[PDB]
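Schema walkthrough. Field components (list of strings):
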Amino acid sequence: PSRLRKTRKLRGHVSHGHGRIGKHRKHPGGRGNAGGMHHHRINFDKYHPGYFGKVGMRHYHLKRNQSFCPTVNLDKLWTLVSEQTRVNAAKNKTGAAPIIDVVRSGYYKVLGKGKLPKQPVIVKAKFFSRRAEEKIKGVGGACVLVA
Amino acid sequence: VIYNEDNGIVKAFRNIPGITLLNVTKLNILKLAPGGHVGRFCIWTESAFRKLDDLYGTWRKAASLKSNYNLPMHKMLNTDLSRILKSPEIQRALRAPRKKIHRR
Amino acid sequence: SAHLQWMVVRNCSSFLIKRNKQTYSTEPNNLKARNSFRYNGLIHRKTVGVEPAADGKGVVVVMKRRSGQRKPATSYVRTTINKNARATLSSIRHMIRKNKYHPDLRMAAIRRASAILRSQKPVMV
Amino acid sequence: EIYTVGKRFKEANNFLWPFKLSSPRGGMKKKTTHFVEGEDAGNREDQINRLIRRMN
Amino acid sequence: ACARPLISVYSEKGESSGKNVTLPAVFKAPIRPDIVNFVHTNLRKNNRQPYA
Amino acid sequence: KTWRRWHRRVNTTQKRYAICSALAASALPALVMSKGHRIEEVPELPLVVEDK
Amino acid sequence: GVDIRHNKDRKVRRKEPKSQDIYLRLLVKLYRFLARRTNSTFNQVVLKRLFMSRTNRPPLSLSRMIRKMKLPGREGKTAVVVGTITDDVRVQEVPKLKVCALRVSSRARSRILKAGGKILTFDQLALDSPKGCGTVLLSGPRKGREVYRHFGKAPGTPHSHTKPYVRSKGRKFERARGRRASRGYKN
RNA sequence: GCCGGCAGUCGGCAGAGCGAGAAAGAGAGUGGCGCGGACGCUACGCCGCGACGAGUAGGAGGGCCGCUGCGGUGAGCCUUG
RNA sequence: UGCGAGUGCCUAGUGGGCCACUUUUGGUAAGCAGAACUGGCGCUGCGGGAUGAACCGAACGCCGGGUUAAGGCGCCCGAUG
RNA sequence: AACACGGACCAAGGAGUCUAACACGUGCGCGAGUCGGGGGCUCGCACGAAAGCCGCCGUGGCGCAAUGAAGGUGAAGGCCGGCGCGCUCGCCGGCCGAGGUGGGAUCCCGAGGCAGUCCGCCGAGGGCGCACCACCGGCCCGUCUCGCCCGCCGCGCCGGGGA
RNA sequence: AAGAGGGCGUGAAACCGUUAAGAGGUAAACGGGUGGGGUCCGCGCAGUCCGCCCGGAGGAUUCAACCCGGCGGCGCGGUCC
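Field assembly_structure (string):
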């Protein structure tokens, strides 16, 4: 919608909304990120710290498939399975302890963020955290690895 | 005219000007509301009219022909506010009005 | 309902006509023809209309039924008023006040029926 | 409460809007200088009552 | 589902037949003309041939 | 240029939102007359006919 | 002439909602009348909050509502929210509730009704409590947006924890001269 | 700018007010002839007070200011122009 | 003593200034160059100083009546004829 | 106004557009999910090179987890009772279950009054306290210092834990 | 229809010719305020009606109240089917 643009209200004004003393020239400061160290140094220092220089080692042929490790916390753990699984727990005088396969849904490492409701479980994951175990072991469950 | 099965109804309402044929499964917003205005006089058949609750359903049922859809929730139910403002339980809580005009 | 459909018709109706600093609405059953929430012949459940008779002598008065909507063939009922121009206004006055039929258009309907009767008479000497 | 400055005087002056006095009828002596050297600025300790009737 | 009336089926010469259909819940959906206006003024741009 | 943004894509839920409001506005005859259609003689606005 | 600074003469509060929808304006129409007639200041806050923008009335999570409604004193009490009610997946048990909001998500709606709760709309709220007596007014986290983490003191400033504007998070795009003691300086 | 006012046009289903110095109701109970009443309220509307009104670069808002074409709409106009 | 206050986002334009009471540097001096506070022109029309950047008064929506500031009241030119 | 520049006049044309990347604000839909990109399926395409649909409905992008150069690690504790030294430490079972302080729009109780009951309304005082601000705490990762404890399929230049 | 006459659908402005009116020694032109003179407009030139009541002059196949038929509204019919 060009009829709602600022250009329609600027018809008549000589400078067209861009100053009378300093006219809108082609490129006053320079094209692109011109002068990272010179004449634009203050903007790069107090808004983009750490822009200049090298750090760390270089890994040449880096593949994202090796470093794939999606995480899931204990607070969002019963959403991995259906609602009728957890209501059929703490019942039947057995300690059913349903098995939640983390790798089956598409997560690898299990983290310990959140509060786990009091129901022993069996969790199947490729990786685990130290704080993840003591919440499940504190509840009364057990962790089982898989490859 | 909204038709459900193609059996010659397109062949009939074809030369008479203004009538656009819409399939039930292929309804179009550009013809159900021309010009951005919601008013449109519609003609339905028996098969077309019974498929509307099989295309979208009610609020307590799924679409049953689209995968994941249900009717959107109403922001407000009692749209007629002339009865809400005239309800005795609201008029009880209102104060006396000030309708005397107070000029300079 | 009534307030819900008023906000849609108020600006994009086919009867809407602005035309150099006024606003009017030319739908049937709208006495005083204002594009207003009160003066609207379609959005209401109860509708009062005054319109001159087909033969050019009298006023046919149109009432909404309130018993069945979405049936415009049987939604409106027309009664013809042709009296001595004083009971003509008194009959329409009794259709509103005595029936408790949407009474804010009591006097405005009498105003419209009053001007129609000077249309159906000799006008210029 | 105005004339005799009592112990509720602060909100009395706050209630009154600052007075929109008209221009002095008859003219002023001199606006720029103090009242001592024939001007009208400064402390009009007694002769303000002459000027008030010209404002109002 | 709100209060839904019963809609009759008319024959080819008027004369509403005995077959009556309950009004579908689609007709009780909220009316929001701006969304209808927003959808109409954007879907209509899809059948536009380029000019240059 | 030929590569101006001619087409606009709208979310499927929003596209399905306006059609629910368009069908629900086919009832409420105050809406239909406000479009301009002559409905005064129609026996019932949700006109349902047979499969013949 | 009068020496008055006219730059703050016009207050910048909202008067009319910027939305062109008709259901919100009917709710505004309902609560416009209750604000200037009733002596209840609850209706003025609701009318003030019915004018806000979408980023101004943040969504209220279901578990925060449970946390804020389990406080002592508010039993048999309704909760009125101006934003939207959204489900929280990390809460297991939900008690009986009475919630009023413009919009409730479908996953959160079925959870409240399953536990014997009651979801009301703002038009039914006026019929129940026109003065808002016995109501609890809550709201979502105003600062919970990702936008506010870029605000405040600028980055590259000592004792400032503002997230910089970076196209993608990597080792060599940032954390260099200006951030490291080994590379020039740090703040 | 006013915590501005107006949903109260609550009419033989009626009693027409809440400008008035003072925190709250023209509230329910229980014992001792003549058919009558001007306007209105596009609540994105109507109405009432108080203050103010300069302006370059610049910013914002309203245009029922204007041109071209498109979807609707005016049972629109037009060789009697 | 007077005034409703606090707070968060983007953001144009500007980055050649000049003059004046007072203080004051270099220079014999300058409508010269360079500093401090405050006010103006820039951006500002109006009455007056005959004329006019910055001087005095005074700041501006369109009008009627009345009254003034600074200036003035032999004629031009309103007013001491 | 200039002894600064352009302008003899008139008619037509004539200059802040588009794409992409973004940041903020605003409107809508869904919502810890969101999206259909691309592809495929309906009817031959008038309108239609439009529309509708998808165990492709999530492959994937973004977000829900960050911190490290990296090997890697990864977001909660408190109360009560017992077992060893009250050793503020290790081991066993229940409870609260996501901190506290101050300011906090609203809402609740509310002394009293507008013989005697109910509907409201106001109300000194007392509160759980939305959002948000400040502070003190608590937790995760990198790093520094002080030390002890625990475990084993491989007792080690092992791994984990504390302040 | 040449008031469409071979570069001929209409034929603007700059510019020029002619006619009517007016004016003319401080270049012309402009703003505020009037006055005068014109071309047309108000188809003006015995000056607007609208309701109630009173008086006398005239006319209907007529008023109130009843009977039948049809239509409509309401019904806390305290709680019809």
